[PDB]
Enzyme design. Structure first.
Site, short mmCIF file in Angstrom:
data_model
loop_
_atom_site.label_atom_id
_atom_site.label_comp_id
_atom_site.label_asym_id
_atom_site.label_seq_id
_atom_site.Cartn_x
_atom_site.Cartn_y
_atom_site.Cartn_z
N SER A 16 0.69 -1.21 0.03
CA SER A 16 -0.04 -0.07 -0.09
C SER A 16 0.80 1.31 -0.13
O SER A 16 0.33 2.31 -0.54
CB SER A 16 -1.00 -0.01 1.29
OG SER A 16 -0.32 0.59 2.59
N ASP A 193 -0.02 5.33 12.65
CA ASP A 193 0.22 3.71 12.83
C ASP A 193 1.79 3.29 12.51
O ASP A 193 2.12 2.25 12.41
CB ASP A 193 -0.61 2.98 11.92
CG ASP A 193 -0.57 3.25 10.52
OD1 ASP A 193 0.44 4.06 10.03
OD2 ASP A 193 -1.39 3.39 9.67
N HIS A 196 1.66 4.10 7.60
CA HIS A 196 1.36 4.85 6.62
C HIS A 196 1.32 6.22 6.81
O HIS A 196 0.80 7.00 7.52
CB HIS A 196 -0.28 4.55 6.33
CG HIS A 196 -0.45 3.05 5.95
ND1 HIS A 196 -1.08 2.22 7.05
CD2 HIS A 196 -0.70 2.33 4.79
CE1 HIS A 196 -1.11 1.06 6.50
NE2 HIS A 196 -1.00 1.07 5.44
CL LIG Z 1 -0.07 -2.58 3.04
#
Ligand SMILES: [Cl-]
Length: 218
Positions: A16, A193, A196
């Site tokens: 991601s 977190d 991210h």
């Molecule tokens: Cl991820």
């Protein structure tokens, strides 16, 4: 980009952090939101603005939640099937992360042995078919070196290092880049977190890449 030949196509694949919310329906290259809003998009903007002449063609092949296990399954269509001149890979975060937020699901976990074997195999198959291959270390935005996940993330990073050395890959020390940043701010300033980050955090990632490829400044 000194490291990159002019008119070359660079394919960047990962989780991601690479994905960054891109529209997957476009396939990495396109007109609107093909690169997302992360470091890949930052790299693309940086290279265009500072080196318009270099004409570098960047492709985002990041898929959220991906481990190195997921990468190997789609490597044929998402890497080789695009005929790239360069391949940048950043993987390992989810490989490490699942061992801590889902500790009971053993079946899901990617052990250090599998991580190395799979990562080394992907590189071994890709290194000869490209002009260059870049390995970006997984990271954990946490200065505490004896934190169970940070120390574990360090294990997988070192593992990626000995794969890069073994095949002559370029290694981008993203973790070290964050470690330098964290001398001035708490992780919360970048990412709640610790994974991210905001745009500033992605710029840290992007600048580590650019510096390693010798096109940070202009
Ligand atoms: Cl991820």
């Amino acid at each position: 980009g000194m490291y990159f030949a002019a008119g070359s196509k660079l394919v960047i694949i990962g989780d991601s952090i690479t994905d960054a919310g891109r529209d997957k329906g476009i396939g990495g290259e396109g007109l609107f939101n093909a690169h997302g809003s992360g470091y890949v998009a930052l790299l693309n903007a940086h290279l265009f603005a500072r080196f318009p002449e270099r004409r570098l063609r960047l492709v985002n092949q990041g898929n959220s939640g991906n481990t190195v296990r997921d990468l190997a399954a789609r490597w044929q269509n998402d890497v080789f099937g695009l005929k790239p001149d360069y391949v940048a890979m950043m993987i390992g975060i989810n490989d490490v992360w699942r061992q801590f937020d889902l500790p009971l699901m053993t079946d899901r976990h990617v052990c250090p042995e599998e991580y190395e074997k799979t990562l080394d195999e992907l590189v071994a198959r890709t290194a000869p078919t490209v002009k260059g291959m870049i390995l970006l270390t997984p990271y954990f935005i946490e200065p505490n070196r004896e934190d169970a996940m940070r120390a574990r993330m360090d294990v997988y990073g070192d593992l990626m290092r000995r794969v890069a050395e073994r095949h002559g890959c370029l290694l981008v020390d993203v973790q070290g880049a964050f470690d330098r940043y964290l001398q001035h701010y708490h992780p919360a300033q970048l990412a709640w977190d610790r994974i991210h980050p905001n745009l500033a955090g992605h710029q840290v990632i992007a600048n580590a890449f650019l510096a390693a490829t010798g096109c940070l400044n202009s």
